[PDB]
Amino acid sequence: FVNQHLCGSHLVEALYLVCGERGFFYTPKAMKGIVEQCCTSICSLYQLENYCN
Amino acid sequence: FVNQHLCGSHLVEALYLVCGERGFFYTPKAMKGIVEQCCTSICSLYQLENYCN
């Protein structure tokens, strides 16, 4: 589920599932941020975990 | 949608919708944190916005 383009609620769901009890931060308005890496390009587990707490 | 018990993905979805382009942080393992206020007790828009960036 993480190796695809994930945007909007689809991205937030992936963060929720990957990060679990660590939680996460979703900051879509950071340039070259999670949207650039996971929505407009193909996401990855490595990049999602960058946003877990 | 925000004035009810919201847990797990249901809570993350509410944060996503409320916070919009501000983004948010989801930290379930903080005591008296968002889980205590929104999942085990009834959530509110006021409390959700506490977690927007």
Swiss-Prot record, chains A, B:
SS bond partners: C7-C39, C19-C52, C38-C43
Where is this gene product found? Secreted
Could you say which protein family the record assigns here? Belongs to the insulin family.
> What is this protein for, i.e. what is its function?
Insulin decreases blood glucose concentration. It increases cell permeability to monosaccharides, amino acids and fatty acids. It accelerates glycolysis, the pentose phosphate cycle, and glycogen synthesis in liver.
Subunit composition? Heterodimer of a B chain and an A chain linked by two disulfide bonds.
Associated clinical condition: Hyperproinsulinemia: An autosomal dominant condition characterized by elevated levels of serum proinsulin-like material.
Output this protein's name. Answer: Insulin
Encoding gene per record: INS
Q: Where in the full protein does the shown chain start and end, and how long is the full protein? A: 25 to 110 of 110
